[PDB]
Amino acid sequence: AVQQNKPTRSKRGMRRSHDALTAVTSLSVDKTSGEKHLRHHITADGYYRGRKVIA
Amino acid sequence: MRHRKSGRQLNRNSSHRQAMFRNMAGSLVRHEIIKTTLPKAKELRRVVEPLITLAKTDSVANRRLAFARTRDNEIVAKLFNELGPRFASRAGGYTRILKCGFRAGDNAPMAYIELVDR
Amino acid sequence: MTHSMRL
Amino acid sequence: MIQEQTMLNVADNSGARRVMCIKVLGGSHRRYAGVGDIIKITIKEAIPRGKVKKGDVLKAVVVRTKKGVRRPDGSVIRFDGNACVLLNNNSEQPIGTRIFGPVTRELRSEKFMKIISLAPEV
Amino acid sequence: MIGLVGKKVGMTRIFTEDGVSIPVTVIEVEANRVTQVKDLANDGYRAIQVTTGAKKANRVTKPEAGHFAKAGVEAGRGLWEFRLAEGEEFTVGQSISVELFADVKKVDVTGTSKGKGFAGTVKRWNFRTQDATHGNSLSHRVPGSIGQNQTPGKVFKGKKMAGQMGNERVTVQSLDVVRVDAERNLLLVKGAVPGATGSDLIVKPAVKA
Amino acid sequence: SNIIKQLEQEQMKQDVPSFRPGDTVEVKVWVVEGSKKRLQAFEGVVIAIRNRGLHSAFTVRKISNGEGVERVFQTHSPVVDSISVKRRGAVRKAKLYYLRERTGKAARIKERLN
RNA sequence: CGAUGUCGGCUCAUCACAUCCUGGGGCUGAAGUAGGUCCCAAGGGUAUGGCUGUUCGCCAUUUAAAGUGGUACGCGAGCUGGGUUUAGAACGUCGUGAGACAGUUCGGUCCCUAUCUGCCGUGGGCGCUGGAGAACUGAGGGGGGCUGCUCCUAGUACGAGAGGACCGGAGUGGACGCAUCACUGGUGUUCGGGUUGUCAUGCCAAUGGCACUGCCCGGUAGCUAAAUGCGGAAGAGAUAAGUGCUGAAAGCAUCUAAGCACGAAACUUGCCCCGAGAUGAGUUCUCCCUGACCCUUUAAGGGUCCUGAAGGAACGUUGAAGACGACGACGUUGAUAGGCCGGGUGUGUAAGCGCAGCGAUGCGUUGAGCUAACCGGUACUAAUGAACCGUGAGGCUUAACCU
RNA sequence: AAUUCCUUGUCGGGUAAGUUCCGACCUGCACGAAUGGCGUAAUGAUGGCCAGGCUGUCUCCACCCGAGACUCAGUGAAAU
RNA sequence: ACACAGGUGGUCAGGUAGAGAAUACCAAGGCGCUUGAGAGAACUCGGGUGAAGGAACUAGGCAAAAUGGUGCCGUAACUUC
RNA sequence: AGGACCGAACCGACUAAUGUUGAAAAAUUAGCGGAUGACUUGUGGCUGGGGGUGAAAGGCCAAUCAAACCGGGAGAUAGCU
Numbered sequence A: 001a002v003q004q005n006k007p008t009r010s011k012r013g014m015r016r017s018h019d020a021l022t023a024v025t026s027l028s029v030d031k032t033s034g035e036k037h038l039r040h041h042i043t044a045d046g047y048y049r050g051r052k053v054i055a
Numbered sequence B: 001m002r003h004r005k006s007g008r009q010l011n012r013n014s015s016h017r018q019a020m021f022r023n024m025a026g027s028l029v030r031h032e033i034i035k036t037t038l039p040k041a042k043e044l045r046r047v048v049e050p051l052i053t054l055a056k057t058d059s060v061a062n063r064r065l066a067f068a069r070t071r072d073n074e075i076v077a078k079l080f081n082e083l084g085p086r087f088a089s090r091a092g093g094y095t096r097i098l099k100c101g102f103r104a105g106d107n108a109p110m111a112y113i114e115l116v117d118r
Numbered sequence C: 001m002t003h004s005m006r007l
Numbered sequence D: 001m002i003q004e005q006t007m008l009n010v011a012d013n014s015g016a017r018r019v020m021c022i023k024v025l026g027g028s029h030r031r032y033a034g035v036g037d038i039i040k041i042t043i044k045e046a047i048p049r050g051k052v053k054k055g056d057v058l059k060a061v062v063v064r065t066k067k068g069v070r071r072p073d074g075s076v077i078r079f080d081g082n083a084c085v086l087l088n089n090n091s092e093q094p095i096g097t098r099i100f101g102p103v104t105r106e107l108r109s110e111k112f113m114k115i116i117s118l119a120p121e122v
Numbered sequence E: 001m002i003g004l005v006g007k008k009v010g011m012t013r014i015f016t017e018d019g020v021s022i023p024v025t026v027i028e029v030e031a032n033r034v035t036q037v038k039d040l041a042n043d044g045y046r047a048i049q050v051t052t053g054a055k056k057a058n059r060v061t062k063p064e065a066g067h068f069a070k071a072g073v074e075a076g077r078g079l080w081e082f083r084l085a086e087g088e089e090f091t092v093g094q095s096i097s098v099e100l101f102a103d104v105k106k107v108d109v110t111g112t113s114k115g116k117g118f119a120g121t122v123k124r125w126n127f128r129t130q131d132a133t134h135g136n137s138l139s140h141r142v143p144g145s146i147g148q149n150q151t152p153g154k155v156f157k158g159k160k161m162a163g164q165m166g167n168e169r170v171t172v173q174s175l176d177v178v179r180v181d182a183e184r185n186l187l188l189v190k191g192a193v194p195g196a197t198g199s200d201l202i203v204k205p206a207v208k209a
Numbered sequence F: 001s002n003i004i005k006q007l008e009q010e011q012m013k014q015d016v017p018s019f020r021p022g023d024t025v026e027v028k029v030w031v032v033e034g035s036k037k038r039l040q041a042f043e044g045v046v047i048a049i050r051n052r053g054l055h056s057a058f059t060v061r062k063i064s065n066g067e068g069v070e071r072v073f074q075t076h077s078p079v080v081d082s083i084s085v086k087r088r089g090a091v092r093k094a095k096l097y098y099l100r101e102r103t104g105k106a107a108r109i110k111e112r113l114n
Numbered sequence G: 001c002g003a004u005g006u007c008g009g010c011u012c013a014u015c016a017c018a019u020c021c022u023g024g025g026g027c028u029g030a031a032g033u034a035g036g037u038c039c040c041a042a043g044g045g046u047a048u049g050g051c052u053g054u055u056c057g058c059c060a061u062u063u064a065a066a067g068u069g070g071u072a073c074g075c076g077a078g079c080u081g082g083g084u085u086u087a088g089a090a091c092g093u094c095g096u097g098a099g100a101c102a103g104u105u106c107g108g109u110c111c112c113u114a115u116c117u118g119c120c121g122u123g124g125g126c127g128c129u130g131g132a133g134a135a136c137u138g139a140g141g142g143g144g145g146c147u148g149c150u151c152c153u154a155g156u157a158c159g160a161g162a163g164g165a166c167c168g169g170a171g172u173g174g175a176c177g178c179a180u181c182a183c184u185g186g187u188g189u190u191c192g193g194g195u196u197g198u199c200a201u202g203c204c205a206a207u208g209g210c211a212c213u214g215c216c217c218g219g220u221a222g223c224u225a226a227a228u229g230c231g232g233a234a235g236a237g238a239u240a241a242g243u244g245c246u247g248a249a250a251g252c253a254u255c256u257a258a259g260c261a262c263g264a265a266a267c268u269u270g271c272c273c274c275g276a277g278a279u280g281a282g283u284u285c286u287c288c289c290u291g292a293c294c295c296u297u298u299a300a301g302g303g304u305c306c307u308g309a310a311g312g313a314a315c316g317u318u319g320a321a322g323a324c325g326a327c328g329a330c331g332u333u334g335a336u337a338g339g340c341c342g343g344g345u346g347u348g349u350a351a352g353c354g355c356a357g358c359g360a361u362g363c364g365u366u367g368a369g370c371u372a373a374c375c376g377g378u379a380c381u382a383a384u385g386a387a388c389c390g391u392g393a394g395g396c397u398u399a400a401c402c403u
Numbered sequence H: 001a002a003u004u005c006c007u008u009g010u011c012g013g014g015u016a017a018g019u020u021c022c023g024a025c026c027u028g029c030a031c032g033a034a035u036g037g038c039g040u041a042a043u044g045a046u047g048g049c050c051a052g053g054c055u056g057u058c059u060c061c062a063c064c065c066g067a068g069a070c071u072c073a074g075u076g077a078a079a080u
Numbered sequence I: 001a002c003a004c005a006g007g008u009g010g011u012c013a014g015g016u017a018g019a020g021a022a023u024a025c026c027a028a029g030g031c032g033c034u035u036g037a038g039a040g041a042a043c044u045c046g047g048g049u050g051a052a053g054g055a056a057c058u059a060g061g062c063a064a065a066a067u068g069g070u071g072c073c074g075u076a077a078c079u080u081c
Numbered sequence J: 001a002g003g004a005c006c007g008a009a010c011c012g013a014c015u016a017a018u019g020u021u022g023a024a025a026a027a028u029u030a031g032c033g034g035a036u037g038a039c040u041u042g043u044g045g046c047u048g049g050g051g052g053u054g055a056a057a058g059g060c061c062a063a064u065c066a067a068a069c070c071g072g073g074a075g076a077u078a079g080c081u
Ligand SMILES: CC[C@H]1OC(=O)[C@H](C)[C@@H](O[C@H]2C[C@@](C)(OC)[C@@H](O)[C@H](C)O2)[C@H](C)[C@@H](O[C@@H]2O[C@H](C)C[C@H](N(C)C)[C@H]2O)[C@](C)(O)C[C@@H](C)C(=O)[C@H](C)[C@@H](O)[C@]1(C)O
Pocket: C001, C002, C003, C004, C005, C006, G003, G005, G110, G111, J020
């Protein structure tokens, strides 16, 4: 259950080496408006692939 | 180990799942576009599309089956009167999912599910 | 309770 | 699927009405007995006028199982109630004369041919 | 001789006229075209490489496009090798159908078995479940003890534990061929071969004769 | 599938009389005892039918001399030579395992007269 | 002694060989069968129950056999807690007594979320000297290796007779393992039906909610065993005990010193699986890059602009792939998923209407209606044009050749 | 024998097989008559033993339904 | 010690089925218990079903399964009747 | 009638499982016992530390009992760590 002695700050950083959050590669541009959005998502202004979907 | 098994459990039991799908089908037929989560939207596709296919023939027995699967007479009225003659041409695919970001509270994947008329 | 005890 | 402690009925008229399997003979760690399989039994209930008494440890052969035997055709014949024919402890020959009810054609071999030439159905 | 690459198409049974029913696995053995032939001049060992099936022309990369278009063949899914045991010579592009298995009597089928996922020790290694009652506390299908004490002081390598079950290469040997269809390019073998329906199988003649 | 269904429909027997459960049916089956082959009657109650194409089966329950016997016949097996429906019974289930729980007067069932 | 938790049982083992079985031999007071005894051999195997807290033991019944030990009398951060050994109470006995008793009896809280090593799995990074996509050789590592019975030879060899083979050859089982659901079954709270109580949909009729899925009856696909296929090998090498051939030392003799041949489930291969991080980083095939300049510590140097290639990743639809990564299919030049259509399966003759009945209900329409995960099709819906990473012919030395 | 060491006394019953149980015999190590002896109907969340029914206790596990465990976002300990 | 599955005296007590203040479903009325979203591995918890067998489990039938209501019929030894 | 019987409230705590850095410093869940009495409960009193009270376990006396707590002798004493 408990440790026999405490780990180092080195073994702590090596453990946290795999915790880096991936960035989004690039946001895509809509054809009509030009606003950035995620792929396969609608924009904030409700456009998807050049079509006004939500009011 | 889930090999070729359909249906999502959605962290509910069977009665809660069935009642939740009945409520969501009522809200979708009522408002014609609803915001929900993504897997609930896919399961809602598999629930609400047979009701629209049931509305394609208007009889007493089919309206009673639609009442048995929606329990709202205003919903079965709107189905058999509006969504029947409107969706008469297209064969399947009466609905459309569109992803809309993430929820602010629980970071849940959002979606709009709507009918193909608007 | 003399089960873990070396008695 | 007769294992030990299974209570079988008796197919012939040796005197017992109910026997119990105490050992499935043949092979180390053997679990079950089908139709072709000798079992060692003890006698739990006998008629008062019979050839064998209660508490006799002898051998028997299963003739009917509720699990049922499978034919090479894909078929399966499942009886109702488990049954055995009692045998001589060393001679391997049956004790009673008449044999009640059906048996299987799986049983067809020399000593059980002596058995099977007595049964009404096969 | 060499094996052929086919696809597992379900299971059924055939009825021999004697009365016996035998379960067969149906293996669709398409035309196997030889792409590249290895010989011990360049490679040190002699072999053939075959492909079968078909792929999309937009799903083929230019390395494998050039490798298929180098010698006479068309694009199939996958490439496999066969080791040419002493006395077979094959031109590239040679179509190899199921007549060699029309001659043969026993066969070995190799496939990737169905993946059972992370399984426990009871499912993977046929461990005996402990007591369900009589006092037991949270330890019904747990693996028991895994080692002795201070004297090893460590678990031994190859100790049977839980983990990935399924999804691995399995060979089944000495399966009898019951029928060979050349107009349907089918292969009926007796019994059960590893994989799901539609999985790619390798069919070699039997070695343990 | 397309290949499995094809192989099985060329395996399937052409003429088999359609019956429903509850029908008293007598099956004549082939029986081999070495050199000589024989035909053997098994008359009982059809209690279960499993329609699967070539893999169809039907279970028949018959009370022999003191005992209850149940035989599952593969329909398109070659050892089944003839199936003849002798009495048509009018149960309303598709399976009749309560006849396994019953005996005597309780195990009789009404005739159809469709 | 500022704590190293006991006996027995369960689960999981692992090694030694002083071998219980199987295997190989020598001698026998070895006719055969079956033994005894000794040598070689550790590959595999090596019961179930009754009694007892028991290890042990006795007993019953099998088996080819029911090995003997080590591993904190293996194994409680894996389980149990019957026994001993807390506090209660009693018996016999001892003691004036409080009380005591390897004497008995009834009752009596078993904590831990794993940091490191280890082990089972599964990934990311970088390397492998231009990058990429594949297919392999395989150094090495692991798994597996059990055996009965019946028949033939042959009732022959052997033996007065009773009995009864070696060697060899098939068949058929038991335990064990791997695989897969075609069969036979289980499950199937996502399918159909019955039914009880109550509430609601205005009511009737019809349905729905809740009562453990209310209780049940069947049952699709998946998963699965008790279901069904397969396996253990043959052969090869080198041998152990043992048996030899030729042969001196030692005119003989001698399996041995020279030389030669046999000889076991052990060893190395043969079968199966992993495997080039095998840093000794391998081989083969295919594909992709063919631009200009300046600076300085003119170095396997830095920088700027122009080009971003093969491919990859990301995203999306997903999968008999999966904890997550990964792996696989597809992304409209499209059957990847849902829907839809047709079928199949399952359940059992829907509702409504009409007839018979006083009625419950029965009959006709009607093998109807409904059908999950299945099958074959169909772009109806969702898989967006892109952007992002990855470059611009890839060092030195020596050899062999080509112009 | 809630008492018995030797001891699983010996015989009987029950079991295929019974160190426990039941009935006996007395060799009472070390019962015994109000620190009561021997019975005893009824009672007991009382101790032991046997039987019928019943069953996943077990042979030997399999599948399903939910709650965690697993991933994502928010908050965020502890023994050592 | 906590916005803590505990504890805390009295009064009122509707409908249907029910002997009932049990129990099931409801009315008046009040709540959905102050982290959610997915996925659908091992293992753990709480349940459901299970072929053949039926205590072989185990210290011990522990735990489960079974039994279960009303009316009538019938009911042994023993007994302090 | 009954320290009668079955069985809710109420009182208790026999078995199992879970919890054991708990939801809880003694619980929950599923069964379990008594339930007109030697019953249970509210409010208020009385008994006190070698003392009380005890259908008796050395049990209980404010999460403390083979002599409560608080404060003072007091920096008791410690051949011991
Ligand atoms: C709820 C959780 C509680 O622990 C338990 O109940 C377990 C189950 C006890 O075993 C209980 C129950 C039991 C039978 O042991 C299982 C009994 O023998 C002991 C005396 O008490 C433990 C572990 C005992 O240790 C043991 O003490 C022995 C004297 C020596 C032994 N050592 C040699 C290894 C050691 O581990 C002991 C003393 O209580 C530990 C001390 C630290 C505690 O008091 C702590 C606070 C515990 O009460 C606890 C953690 O809250």
